[PDB]
Amino acid sequence: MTRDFKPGDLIFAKMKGYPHWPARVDEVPDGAVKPPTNKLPIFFFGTHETAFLGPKDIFPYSENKEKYGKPNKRKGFNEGLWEIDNNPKVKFS
């Protein structure tokens, strides 16, 4: 949907030209980190990456977790996938 999301929410981020993957939503930048224009901060778990994608691009993990629950051809499998439903705030460690 177009509706915005909340900080630290579990949602499968879909990168242009890539399958769905369980990531974590981040908060706004300090104010001078060059924020997005029509997208939100998406912290890719397992790969420690970050991609900017709008709401219509990101879907609820509640729908993907029921599909396979884990990545098929995506690196990072079993590397933070169980934390998405347990320790979603591992980035801080």
Structure-determination technique:
NMR
Q: Which helix (DSSP H) or strand (DSSP E) does residue 52 occupy?
A: strand 49-53
Q: What domains sit in the chain, N to C, each tagged with a CATH number? A: 1-93 (2.30.30.140)
Return d(Cα 39, Cα 41) in angstroms, integer: 7
Exposed, middle or buried: residue 5 (CB in 10 Å: 0-12, 13-18, 19+)? middle
Return d(Cα 81, Cα 84) in angstroms, integer: 6
Is 24 strand, coil or helix? strand
